[PDB]
Structures are given as C-alpha cells and as structure tokens.
mmCIF file of C-alpha atoms (C1' of nucleotides) and ligand atoms in Angstrom:
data_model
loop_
_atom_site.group_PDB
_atom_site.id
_atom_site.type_symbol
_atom_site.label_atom_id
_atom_site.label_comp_id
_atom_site.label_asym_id
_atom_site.label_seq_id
_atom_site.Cartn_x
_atom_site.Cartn_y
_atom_site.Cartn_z
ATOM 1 C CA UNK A 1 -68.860 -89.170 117.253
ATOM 2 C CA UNK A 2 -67.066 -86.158 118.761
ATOM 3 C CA UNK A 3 -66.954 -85.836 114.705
ATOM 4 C CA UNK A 4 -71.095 -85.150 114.435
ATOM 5 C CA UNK A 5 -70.268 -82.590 116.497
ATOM 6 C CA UNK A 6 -67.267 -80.954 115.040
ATOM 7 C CA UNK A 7 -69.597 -81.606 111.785
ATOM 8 C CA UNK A 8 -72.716 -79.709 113.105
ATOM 9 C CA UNK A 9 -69.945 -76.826 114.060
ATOM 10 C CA UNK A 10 -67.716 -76.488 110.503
ATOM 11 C CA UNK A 11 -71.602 -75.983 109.323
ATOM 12 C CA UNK A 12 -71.915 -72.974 111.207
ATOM 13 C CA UNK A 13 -69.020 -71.812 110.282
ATOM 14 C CA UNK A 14 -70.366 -71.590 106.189
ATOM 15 C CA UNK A 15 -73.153 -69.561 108.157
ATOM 16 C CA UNK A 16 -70.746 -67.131 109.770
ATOM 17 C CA UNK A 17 -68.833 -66.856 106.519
ATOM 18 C CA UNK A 18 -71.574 -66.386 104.370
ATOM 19 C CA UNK A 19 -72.737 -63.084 106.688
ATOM 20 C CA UNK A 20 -69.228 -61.935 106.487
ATOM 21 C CA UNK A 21 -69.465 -61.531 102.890
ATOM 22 C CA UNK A 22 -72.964 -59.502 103.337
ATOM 23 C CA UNK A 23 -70.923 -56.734 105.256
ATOM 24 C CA UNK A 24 -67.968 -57.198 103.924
ATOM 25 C CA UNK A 25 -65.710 -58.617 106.809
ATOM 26 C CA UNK A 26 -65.170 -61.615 104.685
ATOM 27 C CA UNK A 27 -61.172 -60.598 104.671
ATOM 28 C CA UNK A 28 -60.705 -60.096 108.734
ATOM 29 C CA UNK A 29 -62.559 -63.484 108.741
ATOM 30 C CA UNK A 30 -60.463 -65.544 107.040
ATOM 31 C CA UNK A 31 -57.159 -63.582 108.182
ATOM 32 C CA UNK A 32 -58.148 -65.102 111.679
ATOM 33 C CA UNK A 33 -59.838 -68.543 110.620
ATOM 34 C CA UNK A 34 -56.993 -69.789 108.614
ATOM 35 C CA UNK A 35 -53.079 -69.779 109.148
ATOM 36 C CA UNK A 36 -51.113 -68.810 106.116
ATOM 37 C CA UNK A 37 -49.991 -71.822 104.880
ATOM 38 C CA UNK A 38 -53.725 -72.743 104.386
ATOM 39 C CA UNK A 39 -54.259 -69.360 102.576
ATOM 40 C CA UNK A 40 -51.340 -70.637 100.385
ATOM 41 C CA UNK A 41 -52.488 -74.076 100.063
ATOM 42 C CA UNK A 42 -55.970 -72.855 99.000
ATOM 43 C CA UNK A 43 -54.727 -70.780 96.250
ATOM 44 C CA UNK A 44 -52.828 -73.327 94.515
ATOM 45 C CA UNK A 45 -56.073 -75.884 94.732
ATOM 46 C CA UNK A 46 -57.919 -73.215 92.556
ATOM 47 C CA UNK A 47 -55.198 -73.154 89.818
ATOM 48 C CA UNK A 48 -54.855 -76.903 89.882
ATOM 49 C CA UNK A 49 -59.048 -77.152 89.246
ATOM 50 C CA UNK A 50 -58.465 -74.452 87.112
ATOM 51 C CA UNK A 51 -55.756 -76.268 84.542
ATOM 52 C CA UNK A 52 -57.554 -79.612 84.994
ATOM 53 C CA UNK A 53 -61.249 -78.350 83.596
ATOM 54 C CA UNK A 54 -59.407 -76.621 80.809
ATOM 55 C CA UNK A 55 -57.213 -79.262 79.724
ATOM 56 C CA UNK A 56 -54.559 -78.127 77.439
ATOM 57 C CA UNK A 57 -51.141 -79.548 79.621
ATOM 58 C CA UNK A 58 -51.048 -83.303 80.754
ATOM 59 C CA UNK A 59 -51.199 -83.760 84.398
ATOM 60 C CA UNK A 60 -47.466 -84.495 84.264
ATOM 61 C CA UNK A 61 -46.777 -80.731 82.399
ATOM 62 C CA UNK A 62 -49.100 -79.366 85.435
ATOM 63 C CA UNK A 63 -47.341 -80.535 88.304
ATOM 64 C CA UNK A 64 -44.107 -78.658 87.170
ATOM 65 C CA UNK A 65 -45.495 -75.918 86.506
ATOM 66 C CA UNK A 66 -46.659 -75.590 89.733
ATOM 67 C CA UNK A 67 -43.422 -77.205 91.352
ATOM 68 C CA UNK A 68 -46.281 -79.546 93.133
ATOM 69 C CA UNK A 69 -45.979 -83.522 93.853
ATOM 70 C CA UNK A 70 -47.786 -85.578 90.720
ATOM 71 C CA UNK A 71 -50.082 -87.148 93.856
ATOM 72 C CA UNK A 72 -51.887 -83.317 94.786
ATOM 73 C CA UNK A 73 -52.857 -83.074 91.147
ATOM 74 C CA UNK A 74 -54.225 -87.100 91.176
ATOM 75 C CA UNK A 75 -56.125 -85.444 94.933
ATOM 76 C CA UNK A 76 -57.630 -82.052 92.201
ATOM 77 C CA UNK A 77 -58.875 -85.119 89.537
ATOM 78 C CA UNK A 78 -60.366 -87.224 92.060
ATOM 79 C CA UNK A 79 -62.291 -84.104 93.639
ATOM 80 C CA UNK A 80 -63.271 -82.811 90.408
ATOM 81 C CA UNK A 81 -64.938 -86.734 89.779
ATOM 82 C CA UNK A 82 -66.957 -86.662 92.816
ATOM 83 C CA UNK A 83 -68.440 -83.164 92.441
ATOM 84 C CA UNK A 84 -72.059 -82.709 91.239
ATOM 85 C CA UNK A 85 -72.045 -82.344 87.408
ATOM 86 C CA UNK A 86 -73.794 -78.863 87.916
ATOM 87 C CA UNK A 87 -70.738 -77.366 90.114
ATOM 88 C CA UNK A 88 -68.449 -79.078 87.044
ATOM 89 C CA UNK A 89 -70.108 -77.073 84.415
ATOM 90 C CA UNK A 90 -70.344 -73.875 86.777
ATOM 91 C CA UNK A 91 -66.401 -73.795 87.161
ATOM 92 C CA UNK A 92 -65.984 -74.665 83.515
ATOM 93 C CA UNK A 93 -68.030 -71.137 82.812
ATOM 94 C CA UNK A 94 -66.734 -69.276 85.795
ATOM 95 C CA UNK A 95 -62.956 -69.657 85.251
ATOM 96 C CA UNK A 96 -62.460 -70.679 81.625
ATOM 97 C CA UNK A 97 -64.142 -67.131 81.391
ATOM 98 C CA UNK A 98 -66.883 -64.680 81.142
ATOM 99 C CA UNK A 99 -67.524 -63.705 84.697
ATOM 100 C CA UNK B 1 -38.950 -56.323 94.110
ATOM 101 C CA UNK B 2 -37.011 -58.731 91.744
ATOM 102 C CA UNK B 3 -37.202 -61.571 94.675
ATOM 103 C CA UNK B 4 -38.887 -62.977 97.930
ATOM 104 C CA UNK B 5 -41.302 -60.065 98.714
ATOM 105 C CA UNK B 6 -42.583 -60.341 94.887
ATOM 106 C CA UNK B 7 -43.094 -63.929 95.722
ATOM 107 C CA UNK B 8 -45.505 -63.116 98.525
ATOM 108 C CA UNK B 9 -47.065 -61.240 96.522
ATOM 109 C CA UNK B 10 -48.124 -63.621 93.889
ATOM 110 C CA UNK B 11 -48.924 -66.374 96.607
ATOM 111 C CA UNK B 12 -51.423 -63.646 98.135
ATOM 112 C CA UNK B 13 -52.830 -62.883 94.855
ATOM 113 C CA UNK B 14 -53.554 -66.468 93.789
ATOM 114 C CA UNK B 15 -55.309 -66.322 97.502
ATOM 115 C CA UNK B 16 -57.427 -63.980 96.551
ATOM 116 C CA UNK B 17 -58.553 -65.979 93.311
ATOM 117 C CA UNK B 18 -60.403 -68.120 96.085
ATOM 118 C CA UNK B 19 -61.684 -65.658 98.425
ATOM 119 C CA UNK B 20 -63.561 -64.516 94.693
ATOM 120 C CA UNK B 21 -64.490 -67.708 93.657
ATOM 121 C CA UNK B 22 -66.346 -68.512 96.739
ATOM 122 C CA UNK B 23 -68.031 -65.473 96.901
ATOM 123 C CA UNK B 24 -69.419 -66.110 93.596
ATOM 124 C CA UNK B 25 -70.266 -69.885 94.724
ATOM 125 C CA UNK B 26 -72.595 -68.323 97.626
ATOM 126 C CA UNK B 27 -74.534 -65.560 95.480
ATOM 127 C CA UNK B 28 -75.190 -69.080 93.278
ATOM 128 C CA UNK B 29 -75.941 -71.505 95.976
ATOM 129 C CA UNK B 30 -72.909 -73.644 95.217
ATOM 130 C CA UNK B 31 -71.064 -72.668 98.251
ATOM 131 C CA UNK B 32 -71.025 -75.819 100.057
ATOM 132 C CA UNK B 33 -69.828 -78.477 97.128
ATOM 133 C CA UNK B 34 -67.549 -76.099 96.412
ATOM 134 C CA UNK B 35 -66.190 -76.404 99.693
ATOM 135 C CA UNK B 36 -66.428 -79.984 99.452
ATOM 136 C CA UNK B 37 -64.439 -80.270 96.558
ATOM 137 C CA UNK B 38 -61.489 -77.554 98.262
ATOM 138 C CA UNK B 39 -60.883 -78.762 101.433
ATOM 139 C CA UNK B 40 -60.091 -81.959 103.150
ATOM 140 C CA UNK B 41 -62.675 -83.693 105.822
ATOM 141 C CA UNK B 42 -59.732 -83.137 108.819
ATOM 142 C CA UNK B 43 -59.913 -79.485 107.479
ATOM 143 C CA UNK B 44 -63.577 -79.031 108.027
ATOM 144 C CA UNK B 45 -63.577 -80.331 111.163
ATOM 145 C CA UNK B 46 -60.433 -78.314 112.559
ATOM 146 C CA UNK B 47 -62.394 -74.917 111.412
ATOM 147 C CA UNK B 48 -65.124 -76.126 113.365
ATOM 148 C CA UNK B 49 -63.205 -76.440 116.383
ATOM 149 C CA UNK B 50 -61.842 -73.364 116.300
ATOM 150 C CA UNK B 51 -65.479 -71.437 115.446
ATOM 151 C CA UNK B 52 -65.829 -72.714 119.001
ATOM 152 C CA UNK B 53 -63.181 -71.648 120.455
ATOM 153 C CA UNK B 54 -64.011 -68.191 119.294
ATOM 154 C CA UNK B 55 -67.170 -68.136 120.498
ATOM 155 C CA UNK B 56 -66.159 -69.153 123.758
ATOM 156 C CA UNK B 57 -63.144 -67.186 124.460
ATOM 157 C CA UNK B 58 -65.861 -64.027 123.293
ATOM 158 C CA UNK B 59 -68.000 -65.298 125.606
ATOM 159 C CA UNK B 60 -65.279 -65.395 128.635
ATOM 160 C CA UNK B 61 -67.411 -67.445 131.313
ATOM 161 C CA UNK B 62 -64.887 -70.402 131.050
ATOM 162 C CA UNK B 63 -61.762 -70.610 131.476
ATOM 163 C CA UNK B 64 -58.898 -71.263 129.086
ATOM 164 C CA UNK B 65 -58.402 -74.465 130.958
ATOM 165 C CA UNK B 66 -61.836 -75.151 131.179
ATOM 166 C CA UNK B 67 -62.213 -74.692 127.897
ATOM 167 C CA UNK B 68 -59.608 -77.037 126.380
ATOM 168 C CA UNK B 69 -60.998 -79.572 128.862
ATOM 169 C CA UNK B 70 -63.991 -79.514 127.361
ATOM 170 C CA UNK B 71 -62.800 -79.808 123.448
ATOM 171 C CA UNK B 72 -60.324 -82.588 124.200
ATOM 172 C CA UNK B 73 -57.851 -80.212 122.763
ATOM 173 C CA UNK B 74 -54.309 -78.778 123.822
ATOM 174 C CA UNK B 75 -54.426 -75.499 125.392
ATOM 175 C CA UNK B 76 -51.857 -74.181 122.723
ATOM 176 C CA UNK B 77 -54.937 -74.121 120.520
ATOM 177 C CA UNK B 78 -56.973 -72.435 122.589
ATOM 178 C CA UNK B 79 -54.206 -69.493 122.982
ATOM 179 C CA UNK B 80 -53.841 -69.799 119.145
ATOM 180 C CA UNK B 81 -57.438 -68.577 119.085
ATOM 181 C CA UNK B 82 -56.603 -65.798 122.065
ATOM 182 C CA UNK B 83 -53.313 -64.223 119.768
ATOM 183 C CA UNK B 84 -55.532 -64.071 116.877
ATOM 184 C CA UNK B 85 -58.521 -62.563 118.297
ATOM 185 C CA UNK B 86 -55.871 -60.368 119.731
ATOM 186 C CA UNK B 87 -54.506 -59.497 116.537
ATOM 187 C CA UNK B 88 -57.690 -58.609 114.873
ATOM 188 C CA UNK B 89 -59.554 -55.305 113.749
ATOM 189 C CA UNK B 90 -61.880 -54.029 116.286
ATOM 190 C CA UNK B 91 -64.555 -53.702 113.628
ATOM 191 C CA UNK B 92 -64.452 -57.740 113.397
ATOM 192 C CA UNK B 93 -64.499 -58.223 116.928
ATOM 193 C CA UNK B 94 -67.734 -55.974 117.333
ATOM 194 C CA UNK B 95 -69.432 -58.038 114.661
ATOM 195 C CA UNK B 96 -68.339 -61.255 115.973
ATOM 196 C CA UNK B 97 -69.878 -60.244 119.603
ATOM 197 C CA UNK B 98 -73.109 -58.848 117.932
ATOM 198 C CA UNK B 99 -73.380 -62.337 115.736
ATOM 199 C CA UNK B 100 -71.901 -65.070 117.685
ATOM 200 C CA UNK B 101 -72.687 -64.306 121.334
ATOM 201 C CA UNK B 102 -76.304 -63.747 121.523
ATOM 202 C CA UNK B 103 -77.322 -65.729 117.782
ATOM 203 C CA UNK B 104 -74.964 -68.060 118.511
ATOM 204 C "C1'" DT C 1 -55.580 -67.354 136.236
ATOM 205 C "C1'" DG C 2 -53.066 -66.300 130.811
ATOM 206 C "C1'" DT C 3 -49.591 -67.589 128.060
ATOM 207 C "C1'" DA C 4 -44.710 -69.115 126.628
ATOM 208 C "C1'" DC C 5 -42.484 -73.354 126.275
ATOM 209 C "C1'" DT C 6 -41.222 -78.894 125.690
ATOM 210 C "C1'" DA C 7 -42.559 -83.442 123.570
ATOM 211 C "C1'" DG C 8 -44.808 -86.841 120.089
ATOM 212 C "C1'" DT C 9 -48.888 -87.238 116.628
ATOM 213 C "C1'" DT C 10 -51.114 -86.579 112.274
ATOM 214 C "C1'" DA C 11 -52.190 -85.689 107.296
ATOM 215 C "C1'" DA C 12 -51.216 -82.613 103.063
ATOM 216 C "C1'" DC C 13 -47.344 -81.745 100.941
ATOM 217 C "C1'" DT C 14 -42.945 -82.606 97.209
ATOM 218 C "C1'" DA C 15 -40.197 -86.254 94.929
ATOM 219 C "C1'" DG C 16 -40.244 -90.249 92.478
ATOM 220 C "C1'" DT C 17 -41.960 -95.261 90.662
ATOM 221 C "C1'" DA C 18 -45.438 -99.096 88.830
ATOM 222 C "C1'" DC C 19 -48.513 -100.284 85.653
ATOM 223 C "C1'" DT D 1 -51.122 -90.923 79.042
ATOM 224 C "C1'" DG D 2 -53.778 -91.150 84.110
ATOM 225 C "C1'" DT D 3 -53.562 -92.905 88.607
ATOM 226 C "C1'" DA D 4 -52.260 -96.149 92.458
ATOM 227 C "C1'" DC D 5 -48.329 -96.549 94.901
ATOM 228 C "C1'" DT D 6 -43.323 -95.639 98.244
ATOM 229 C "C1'" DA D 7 -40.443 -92.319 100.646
ATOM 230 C "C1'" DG D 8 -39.397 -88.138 103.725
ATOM 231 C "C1'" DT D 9 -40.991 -83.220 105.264
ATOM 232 C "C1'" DT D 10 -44.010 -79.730 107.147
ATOM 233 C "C1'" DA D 11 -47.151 -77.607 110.439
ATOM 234 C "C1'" DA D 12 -51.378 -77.790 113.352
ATOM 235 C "C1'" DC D 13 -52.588 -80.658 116.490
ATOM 236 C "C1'" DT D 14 -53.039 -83.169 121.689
ATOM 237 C "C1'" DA D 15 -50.696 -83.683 126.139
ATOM 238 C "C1'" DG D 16 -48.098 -81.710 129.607
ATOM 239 C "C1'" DT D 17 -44.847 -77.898 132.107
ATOM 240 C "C1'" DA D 18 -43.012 -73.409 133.846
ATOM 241 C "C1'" DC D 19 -43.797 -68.808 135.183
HETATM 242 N N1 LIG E 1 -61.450 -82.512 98.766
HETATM 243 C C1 LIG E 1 -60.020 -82.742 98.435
HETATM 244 C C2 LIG E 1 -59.266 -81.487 98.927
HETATM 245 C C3 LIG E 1 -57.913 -81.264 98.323
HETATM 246 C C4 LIG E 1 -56.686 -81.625 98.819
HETATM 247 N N2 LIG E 1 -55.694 -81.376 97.864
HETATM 248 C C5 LIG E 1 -56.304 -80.919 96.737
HETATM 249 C C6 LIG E 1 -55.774 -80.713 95.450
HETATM 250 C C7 LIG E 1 -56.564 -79.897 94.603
HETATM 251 C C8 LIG E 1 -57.943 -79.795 94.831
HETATM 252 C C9 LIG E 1 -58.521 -80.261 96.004
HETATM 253 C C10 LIG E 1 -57.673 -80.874 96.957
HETATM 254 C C11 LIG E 1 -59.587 -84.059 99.309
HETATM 255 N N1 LIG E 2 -55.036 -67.263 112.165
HETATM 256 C C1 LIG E 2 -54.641 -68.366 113.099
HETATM 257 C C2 LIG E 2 -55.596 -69.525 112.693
HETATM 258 C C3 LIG E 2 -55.819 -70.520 113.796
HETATM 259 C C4 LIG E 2 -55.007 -71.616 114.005
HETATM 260 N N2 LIG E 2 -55.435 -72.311 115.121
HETATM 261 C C5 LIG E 2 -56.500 -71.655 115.652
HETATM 262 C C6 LIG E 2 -57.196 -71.862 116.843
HETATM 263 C C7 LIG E 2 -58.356 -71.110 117.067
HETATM 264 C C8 LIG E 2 -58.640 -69.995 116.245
HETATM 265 C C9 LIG E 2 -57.782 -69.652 115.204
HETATM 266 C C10 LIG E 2 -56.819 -70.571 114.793
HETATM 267 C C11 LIG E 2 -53.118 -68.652 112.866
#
DNA sequence: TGTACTAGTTAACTAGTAC
DNA sequence: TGTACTAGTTAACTAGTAC
C-alpha cells in the first residue's frame, strides 16, 4: 500500500499542474517532471487516439505509419474502450476539428 | 535541416499537441480521464514520487540519504531530481517554493 | 555531506504470429 | 479485419560504492 500513497501524491501532482497552467509555467513544469523519452512517448499516444477516433486507415495501415509495434495501437483501442463516453465524444470534437 | 535536427523538431512539435490538449481537458473538467486514458498506472505513480522528491529537496531539512531512505528509492533518483531542479529557470523555482513549501 | 559511478530489475516499446 | 499472443530492446528504476 506504499501505492495509496504514491496514489494520494500523482493526485497532487494534477493540482500542481493545473496552477502551472494559470501562470503559465506549465512548460518549465513538464521540462523537469518528465524525461524526454516520455515527452516523445506522449506525443505519439495523441496521434495514435487521434487516427483511431477518426477511422479512415486500419489499425494495421496505422502502425506503419507511425513505425510503432501493432501491440501500442491494440494499448490506444483498449484505452479509448474504457474511457467515459463523454471524454470519447469530447476528443472526437476537439481533434477531428473545430477548436 | 534536411535530417536529424528536423527530426527533433517534429517529435517536439507532436509534444506540444499534448501539452494543448490537456490544457483544453482542464478549462473542461476532463483533465483527469484524460490522463487516465494517456498514461500507464506505473507512470502515475513514478510522477508522484518524484513531486516528492521535489518538495523535499526544496524543503532541504533531510538529507539526500535520508531522503531516499524514506521513499524506498535509489539515491540516483533523488540526484535525478537535484540535476533537474538544478537545471531549471529561476522563475519556476520561485513558484515552486511559494506553492509547494508552505501549501504543500 | 552531494554526486558520479557499478550492477540487476521492470514495463513500454518495435517486430512479428495466431486466430 | 481487430486483438490476444511470443520475442528482444530500451530506459527509469532500486540497491550499493567511490570520492
Ligand atoms: N492508459 C494506457 C496508456 C498507454 C500506453 N500506451 C498507449 C498507446 C496509446 C494510448 C494510450 C497508451 C495503458
Ligand atoms: N527531467 C528529469 C525527469 C525526472 C526523472 N527522474 C526524476 C526524479 C525526480 C525528479 C525529476 C525526475 C529527467
């Protein structure tokens, strides 16, 4: 249960983050939160979402696109099926455009 | 260029795609499935352990060793945390102190 | 004391296959 | 066509050492 705890911890760390934004040290933040590679690993979790909600490549088409293993795009679908309906429909109007 | 540093560049931009669409998720109250659905569990709880260790090294009333004793983590972690801090913009740091240290 | 180093551990990754 | 699987690699981690 030294998980609770790292649990209770992350949270604050939304906290932090979201105060960031308001004063716009969001950047520094995440510059000294995350290593590179996870900046890197983030970005291509966004485009796989991204291609997923809008559905015009198979899943095989995707992954070499990308250059990524068939198995992190099966990780994006599997997400994407556990999410609340009402974050679904908000990335389907967020990215597929208008915003 | 017409190679690697191009590359970098397109890797940061596609970064920045996130750092936009959470911003957006938090002025909608959608921050936190959002962040469900982008990171892993053992990803969560590493940033959590190291939104300690920032705090405490601000802090400075324990020691490094002290410290790692207390996380049940490696000191190379801890000094992780130290470069960083290290390498970051004074303006950060302030804020960080002002936040952190007294809030908590 | 802070911090550079060595080792093995762990989980997200790319590559490919089974239905 | 999607998705559950098998491999090996990568990088942040815990544990421990040398200045
Ligand atoms: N919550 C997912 C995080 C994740 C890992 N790889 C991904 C691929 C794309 C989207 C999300 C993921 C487990
Ligand atoms: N920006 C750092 C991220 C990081 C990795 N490990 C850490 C330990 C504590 C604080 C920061 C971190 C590289």
């Amino acid at each position: 249960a030294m998980a609770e705890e790292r649990h209770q911890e992350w949270l604050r760390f939304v906290d932090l983050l979201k105060n960031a934004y308001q004063n716009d040290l969001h950047l520094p933040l995440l510059n000294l939160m995350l290593t590179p590679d996870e900046r890197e690993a983030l970005g291509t979790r966004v485009r796989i979402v991204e291609e997923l909600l809008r559905g015009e490549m198979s899943q095989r088409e995707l992954k070499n696109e990308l250059g990524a293993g068939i198995a992190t795009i099966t990780r994006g679908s599997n997400s994407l099926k556990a999410a609340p309906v009402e974050l679904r429909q908000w990335l389907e109007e967020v990215l597929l455009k208008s915003d």
